[PDB]
Subunit: 330 residues, 2 copies
């Protein structure tokens, strides 16, 4: 009996969401489909140009934890907010979903991280993130008992941007593996991969990470190739299990020489791709920690991801457990 199926660790962020036309991205030099890091001044400037918006709790790993809880798994989260209204919102939403969240704010400045996410007509999302209080996440925020009691500890590639978060993750890896648990990461973003390519490969090759999540763009970036088949062969050689998503083309799960291809679900419309990779990870890890086959893990992931992209906001507002039952997956 273990307390948690999945612990996730990431940048605790509230999303500020608006729809824009494609010229808006060009005029403001926002890299489309990417996570664009911004300072406080740029955040104010961008906000001043943004239309009326919606707010929703975000953070890649936060979304993944919420998804696992939604499906019926037991989840926990480490991430740092400020003692402010945005932080109170973040804390409420993740705990309300049934995720264990106990990371204490350190003060009111820097303020809670926020990401201005612009959704274009094609449903693509372009994020503009001020890290704020996320820069204060460190080893002191590792709840050692929680890591020890979680089947899988999953973390964001994005954690390599703030200065001390990587130290916390190294502590997590040691505790997890001392207790026979598994470590997982997502490559997060192709530009994130570009920034930390050598470090990410070292995490995988040293065995600090057991299960890796990537999309097509991240996998291509990791090996700096345009050959997707090369990327798949290389990622399989670098980690024990790789789960590679391919948008409308579904996903492929690799283990050694094993490959399991899974189809994307049928969708009404792509409203907002925000959270797709996050929720794929939720589905996958839920299945993984329930002892499901790798293909069925992929199927659960594709289900969760296809659901999230048909709504505004990064965390499904409907029951994923009910959808899984109806899809005949649980």
């Amino acid at each position: 009996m273990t307390r948690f199926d999945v612990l996730t660790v990431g940048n605790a962020i509230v999303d500020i969401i608006s729809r824009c036309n494609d010229q808006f991205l060009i005029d403001n030099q926002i890299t489309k489909a990417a996570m664009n890091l911004i300072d406080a001044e740029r955040a104010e400037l961008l906000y001043s140009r943004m239309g009326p918006a919606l707010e929703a709790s975000g953070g890649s790993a936060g979304n993944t934890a919420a998804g696992v809880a939604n499906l019926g798994g037991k989840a926990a989260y480490f991430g740092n907010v400020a003692a402010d209204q945005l932080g109170d919102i973040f804390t409420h939403d993740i705990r309300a979903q049934g995720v264990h969240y106990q990371t204490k704010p350190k003060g009111a400045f820097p303020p809670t991280a926020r990401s201005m996410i612009f959704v274009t007509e094609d449903g693509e999302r372009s994020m503009n993130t001020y890290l704020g209080a996320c820069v204060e996440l460190g080893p002191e925020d590792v709840e050692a008992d929680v890591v020890a009691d979680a089947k899988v500890t999953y973390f964001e590639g994005y954690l390599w941007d703030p200065p001390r978060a990587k130290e916390a993750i190294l502590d997590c890896a040691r505790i997890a593996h001392q207790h026979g648990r598994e470590m997982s990461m997502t490559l997060s973003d192709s530009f994130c991969v570009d920034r930390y390519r050598g470090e990410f490969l070292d995490l995988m090759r040293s065995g600090k990470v057991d299960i890796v999540f990537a999309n097509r763009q991240e996998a291509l970036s990791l090996y700096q190739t345009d050959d997707f088949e090369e990327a798949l062969n290389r990622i399989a050689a670098d980690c024990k299990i790789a789960a590679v998503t391919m948008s409308e083309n579904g996903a492929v799960i690799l283990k050694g020489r094993e490959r399991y291809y899974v189809n994307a679900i049928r969708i009404r419309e792509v409203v907002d791709t925000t959270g797709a990779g996050d929720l794929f990870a939720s589905g996958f890890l839920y299945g993984y920690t329930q002892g499901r086959s790798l293909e069925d893990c992929g199927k659960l992931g594709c289900l969760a991801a296809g659901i999230v992209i048909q709504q505004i906001g990064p965390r499904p507002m409907t029951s994923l457990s009910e959808a899984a039952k109806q899809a005949g997956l649980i």
Copy 2:
């Protein structure tokens, strides 16, 4: 030419929105379909029981102002927030829509008003509102030049709950009428009417209010009758123009002995009724200040209301002017 078509005045509120089951309202003694006023302690309690939520700028008059601007009219707004993150969200969203909004916060405490809005499976909304900084709105917040330069000044019945807002409205009425402008009010909520019945009737009978908006429930409450036909006859006798909404049954506009019935638009599915009345007022007032017939004002009102109820959140995220053009209302 006047600077503004519509000035609105109301409680500046950020909405915190979640879906709930029918049992949740009963268990928490929340009056369904109503605005339930709550103190700080109850706000904390209710939030602790609320699921993961979405935040969006609200406030009945705020929504109406935003709707006028969306349609292409020139709008302004008076309402008091705190110097906090919620207040900064509110200020951003209304100004981003192109509404003139210059009410300065008086400090961080009390904090910005928020309303926990619970949406049931039928799409009905039940609001639970902590007024916070709204209690500070007073005569000092009247921008006299704006009232003087606005074709219509419209305000909430809800303004009778905070202590000094009514004094601001009486100042508005004097300035508006001295400058040959018109005053309008919404009855807001049937329990609000029950609280201020005598005062609302006096506003109308004294001629401080020229145009009144009501739904069926509010009209029935105003005259404490269950005879809707009596309520229509009475409201017509009490104000120069009455616009009375009847949910799926459309609307009726009254002027003296004239009655103009308008059909509601036919809906796929009612997602969330939040903002329906507010946006009916936006369409009506936009039409009115453009010199349109009372029937066409009612038509524009129903168009805007039908749009807002098919989305989560109180302010339409799509173009109302484009919708009106397609409808030949222009």
